[PDB]
């Protein structure tokens, strides 16, 4: 089959930067008889299906911003974004339709850089309904921060707890370029009821002092 090789695998740029990404095919996609290149580009935003950007290597689909330009011929193709916007975070895929079987590249992930932003931190004790059902999850919610890599520290009665913690991040926001995350500490009800103070602390590259929320079991 024709192998489509995309590079770089990922890149991160601030709003306004020019970006170029490359797609190289293992054989030429130029049909000698009509001098057309049988290549399309797609954009896949987080949580969405792919959307067609370009076909015939350089023809832009209706509704696609003119900041996207496809170029190249034969085996070596480029998608250029003249000035990136915050909403352009996505995986970009090329695809050949020169010959069966039809094949896609492995994608280039485009992420957005912005100024550091400290999270706001929220904490939620186990619900009485969960406690009645027999479990205990303490949920910590970190909102609108940057960069993605933030450290979350849990303490139970002043001692650091790492076991039993599950973390999940939202995809990067298409408007403000920030992240949010949840950190969930799950214990048995009996284990939860054996301790009093619960603390979630976020440490980032914004501040040296953490952003903290804490509660005492029963003290409510």
């Amino acid at each position: 089959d024709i192998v489509m090789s995309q590079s770089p695998s990922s890149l991160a740029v601030s709003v306004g930067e020019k970006v170029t990404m490359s797609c190289k095919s293992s054989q030429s996609l130029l049909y000698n008889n009509n001098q057309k290149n049988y290549l399309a580009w797609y954009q896949q935003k987080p949580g969405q299906s792919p959307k067609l950007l370009i076909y015939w290597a350089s023809t832009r689909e209706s509704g696609v911003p003119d900041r996207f330009t496809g170029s190249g011929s034969g085996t070596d193709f480029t998608l250029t974004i003249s000035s990136v916007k915050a909403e352009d975070l996505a995986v970009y895929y090329c695809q050949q339709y020169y010959s069966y079987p039809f094949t896609f590249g492995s994608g280039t992930k485009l992420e957005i850089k912005r100024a550091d932003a400290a999270p706001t931190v929220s904490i939620f004790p186990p619900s009485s309904e969960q406690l009645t059902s027999g479990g205990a999850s303490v949920v910590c919610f970190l909102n609108n921060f940057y960069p993605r890599d933030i450290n979350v520290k849990w303490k139970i009665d002043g001692s650091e707890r790492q076991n039993g913690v599950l973390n999940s991040w939202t995809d990067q926001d298409s408007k403000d370029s920030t992240y949010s995350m949840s950190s969930t500490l799950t214990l048995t009800k009996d284990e939860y009821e054996r301790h009093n103070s619960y603390t979630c602390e976020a440490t980032h590259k914004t501040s040296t002092s953490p952003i903290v929320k804490s509660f005492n079991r029963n003290e409510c």
Partner: protein, 230 residues
């Protein structure tokens, strides 16, 4: 101008036959130049073309699966179907249908939202939905966070909305995490004005279609009393 929507079984067991349907509007496979294809994407992976069919009933299939695939179109012209025989775990993926953007060439101009198919012998389980109640401990400045914990379900996905879709700004529904138990869990958290907590009702609408689980959970504020504290 065009819509496409995939539907499938959500989950099926290894060795069974997957039956997928694409229902579409704004074009018909009764009409010259129209065709539809199927493309899949395993979680965190790339795109694989599977099969496509044209108005003239010509069908093409990916040789990596050809023996196992059957594509067809409905006589009405408004649906296309894909069958995959003898599924295994490599068939777990999001399945998309998409219209070809040409009468003879195979790029795809409009795509459906996709349908997730999980190949698994594990049992279907619906989630428990627990409130994440707002308090001083979820309040910073003039903003309060509140949410729902959607716990212990299988397979994916669940959908969560707030106030039937009335509330959308400031909503963060986290990707599910598969726990060692074989069950998923996630939380959906929304941030709202703290001054609104007394007068505005907040309900999370959770739907887990594989288990026919539908829950509308009202999330009530829970302020804390601080003993012996000024």
């Amino acid at each position: 101008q065009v819509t496409l929507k995939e539907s499938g079984p959500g989950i099926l067991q290894p060795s069974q036959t997957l039956s997928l349907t694409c229902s579409f509007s704004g074009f018909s496979l009764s009409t010259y130049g129209m065709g539809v294809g199927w493309i899949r994407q395993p979680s965190g992976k790339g795109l694989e073309w599977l099969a496509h069919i044209w108005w003239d009933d010509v069908k093409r299939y990916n040789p990596a699966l050809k023996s196992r695939l059957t594509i067809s179109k409905d006589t009405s012209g408004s649906q296309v179907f894909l069958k995959i025989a003898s599924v295994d775990t490599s068939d777990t993926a999001t399945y998309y249908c998409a219209r070809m953007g040409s009468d003879y060439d195979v790029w795809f101009d409009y795509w459906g939202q996709g349908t997730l198919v999980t190949v698994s012998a594990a049992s279907t389980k619906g989630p428990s939905v627990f409130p994440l109640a707002p308090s001083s401990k979820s309040t910073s400045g003039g903003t309060a966070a509140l949410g729902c914990l959607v716990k212990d379900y299988f397979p994916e996905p669940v959908t969560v909305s707030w106030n039937s879709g009335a509330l959308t700004s400031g909503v963060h529904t986290f990707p599910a995490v598969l726990q060692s138990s074989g069950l998923y869990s996630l939380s959906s958290v929304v941030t709202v004005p703290s001054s609104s907590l007394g007068t505005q009702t907040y309900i999370c609408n959770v739907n887990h279609k594989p288990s026919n689980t539908k829950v509308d959970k009202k999330v009530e504020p829970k302020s804390c009393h601080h003993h012996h504290h000024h």
